């Protein structure tokens, strides 16, 4: 599977960052960490890019949709890029982990924990003026041997880190109650 992310950062910026890192991390992917990671807060977070707040980087399931999201949150940019990302366990199905509490179910978001490393980026499309300019530029640092046959993280692993606020209804309901961190149970 491939996931897609419309992002305003140029391939050169991504290379320098070591990947597509969350908004709260200042160092290269392998060097630093988001200052705060919370899936629930992230899915609700609204500036100058597509959702990448609270330790996660948003991706969607199709080029068409990443493009729509691009025109929506990145409209106003003369140019942006749509990164093609290989499936791996750092990607969490937001609709599947948050259930009925998923804020933007239409987005089919697959949240990338801590961002996406450069070796996971298969390639990218350049979007000039709202139009996809040409074909996909293959990322030379993509490491196929590392990602061949991996898939997104199973929902069970996400329930434990859903991050709903303390005393939120979800913490008293199955499945979340069965995986909730101690200090979150009522």
């Amino acid at each position: 599977n491939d996931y897609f992310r419309a992002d305003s950062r140029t391939p050169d910026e991504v290379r320098r960052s070591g990947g597509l890192i969350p908004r709260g991390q200042d160092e290269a992917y392998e060097r630093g960490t988001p200052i705060n990671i919370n899936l629930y807060d992230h899915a609700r977070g609204t500036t100058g890019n597509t959702r990448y707040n609270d330790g996660y980087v948003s991706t969607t399931t199709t080029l068409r949709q990443a493009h729509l999201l691009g025109q929506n949150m990145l409209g106003g940019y003369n140019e942006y890029y749509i990164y093609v990302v290989a499936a791996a366990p750092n990607l969490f199905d937001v609709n599947g982990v948050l259930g009925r509490y998923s804020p933007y179910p239409s987005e089919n978001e697959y949240a990338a924990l801590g961002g996406i490393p450069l070796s996971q980026i298969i390639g990218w499309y350049r979007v000039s003026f709202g139009a996809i300019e040409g074909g996909m530029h293959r990322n030379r640092d993509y490491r196929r041997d590392l990602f061949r046959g991996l898939s997104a993280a199973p929902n069970e692993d996400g329930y434990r880190i859903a991050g709903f606020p303390d005393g939120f209804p979800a913490w008293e309901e199955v499945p979340w109650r069965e995986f909730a961190p101690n200090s979150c149970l009522p």
Binding site: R144, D145, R148, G149
Partner: protein, 98 residues
């Protein structure tokens, strides 16, 4: 699938071409009777990897093992040219496909 070079090469011999196989197990067995190196596919199929003492086949067999293990470790499929004259079938040529 098998490159043309590989198909034509295998079809030139008495072995049989086996395309797009996923290796999921890698066995090293020194027990005196099953002594050898085997691979098992996702479909349960078993094959033995050829061994050789002398030059130059000792190089080709060593690479065969390296190819088998790399397939197991990465999920990259392999095409084979194996002799059905034994059970398990013996691998005479292997192609790692990325």
């Amino acid at each position: 699938g098998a490159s043309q070079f590989f198909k034509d090469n295998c079809n030139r011999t008495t072995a049989s071409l086996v395309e797009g196989v996923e290796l999921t197990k890698y066995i090293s067995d020194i027990n005196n009777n099953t002594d050898g190196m085997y691979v098992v596919s996702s479909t349960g199929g078993v094959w033995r990897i050829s061994r050789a003492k002398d030059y130059p086949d000792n190089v080709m067999t060593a690479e065969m093992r390296k190819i088998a293990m790399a397939a197991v470790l990465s999920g990259m499929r392999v095409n084979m040219c194996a002799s059905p004259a034994s059970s398990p079938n013996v691998i005479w040529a292997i192609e790692l496909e990325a």
